[PDB]
Design an enzyme around this catalytic site. Sequence first.
Site, PDB file in Angstrom:
ATOM      1  CG  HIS A 102      -2.043   0.916  -4.602  1.00 59.92           C
ATOM      2  ND1 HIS A 102      -2.313   0.375  -3.359  1.00 59.92           N
ATOM      3  CD2 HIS A 102      -2.125  -0.103  -5.490  1.00 59.92           C
ATOM      4  CE1 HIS A 102      -2.519  -0.923  -3.488  1.00 59.92           C
ATOM      5  NE2 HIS A 102      -2.426  -1.239  -4.773  1.00 59.92           N
ATOM      6  CE  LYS A 104      -6.340  -0.756  -4.872  1.00 55.12           C
ATOM      7  NZ  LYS A 104      -5.730  -0.257  -6.122  1.00 55.12           N
ATOM      8  CG  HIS A 318      -6.415  -6.958  -4.108  1.00 53.83           C
ATOM      9  ND1 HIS A 318      -6.868  -5.656  -4.158  1.00 53.83           N
ATOM     10  CD2 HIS A 318      -5.290  -6.994  -4.862  1.00 53.83           C
ATOM     11  CE1 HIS A 318      -6.027  -4.930  -4.886  1.00 53.83           C
ATOM     12  NE2 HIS A 318      -5.075  -5.725  -5.340  1.00 53.83           N
ATOM     13  CE  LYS A 320      -4.196  -3.404  -1.201  1.00 53.58           C
ATOM     14  NZ  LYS A 320      -3.895  -4.769  -1.760  1.00 53.58           N
TER      15      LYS A 320
END
Lengths: 425, 6
Positions: A102, A104, A318, A320
């Site tokens: 996950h 990025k 999107h 966090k």
Amino acid sequence: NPFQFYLTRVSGVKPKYNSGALHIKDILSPLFGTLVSSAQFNYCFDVDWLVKQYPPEFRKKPILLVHGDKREAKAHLHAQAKPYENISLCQAKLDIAFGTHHTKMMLLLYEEGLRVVIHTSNLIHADWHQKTQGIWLSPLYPRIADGTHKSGESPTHFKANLISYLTAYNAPSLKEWIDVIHKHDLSETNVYLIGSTPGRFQGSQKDNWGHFRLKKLLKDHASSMSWPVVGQFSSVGSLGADESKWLCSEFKESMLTLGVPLYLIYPSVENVRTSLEGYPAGGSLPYSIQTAEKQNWLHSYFHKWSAETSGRSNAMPHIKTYMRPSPDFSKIAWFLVTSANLSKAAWGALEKNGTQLMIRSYELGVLFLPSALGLDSFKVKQKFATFPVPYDLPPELYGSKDRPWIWNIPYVKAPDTHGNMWVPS
Amino acid sequence: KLNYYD
């Protein structure tokens, strides 16, 4: 500006709201460096789209795609990449069920040095169009001189920590990137790296990853002084039958460590319905009714998305983020931008009577601590020394008629921004 | 993977 924290550009808001914002084409532009090679760590990829974000002159430099796809999905990704001879792929091992790769991150090697970008966006057009996303940009790290003896390490141990994170993949194509990092001077870095990698971690190893990593950093590099904890995310894992199983026990316990009200921010149906994208924003907020119905207690902590400060109330999050504001929300003890959502999969859960931390996934974030700048706290920048919080404070509680956005049930009583309903199936 | 729903 010491933070180098940016939001992505949002199409369809007034220009003043995009002035300090960045699009992926900005990040990859020749103004940022003369590109030699790059690595793109992510979850979802659209390769044709991705290649088009690179400037034409850099479009033929080697690109490494670090993904978690298996079986058929892996075959499809290889097929999209095949046309582009300069693209290689690295499949990150996911030995634990329900784990995802996950993280990025971009590793950008230039003629002039190296840059690390840690961010929240998938490499697909829709993640960079009308969403609220966050980016941290490292400085341009120079190469360590040919005949010199330096570690290139920062006081936050960022260089070592990043090498450790890459080393856990146990992947040949990342060893070359590890060697590249060894050769550069990362000493100017003023953030702490917080990573998750899949595994079961025992003893000293618990502090290396997930929420125990955060706990360790907050213990060692923050000082104690009623200060709430704020968590803001776009996916919600199965947290257990009640708040004491994980959320308020091990998770809040890590987050409130220093040297307590808990606010969780997650879009309601009304937030999504009236967004720039409308209901399809919900395609990136994958909270399922199967999960939600197990844990209705959680929803009492839910607060609306509101971002007037950055002109982004209609740009669904999107990004966090996690942080620790003072009781009046005018300062913060720390701020974290990360790929990690509100899940045990991402953050870790204690197993075997609490001697083992189990993490399912790869995640990566950067922690901003006042001590790293010689401060005690950061003042909150009220309008996006002063930390740019991208959403409004204090967070607003769900109204009695509000519900969390749940992506796999129908919404057919009111049309969204574009006159459409939502009927998954 | 092109997005969350495939």
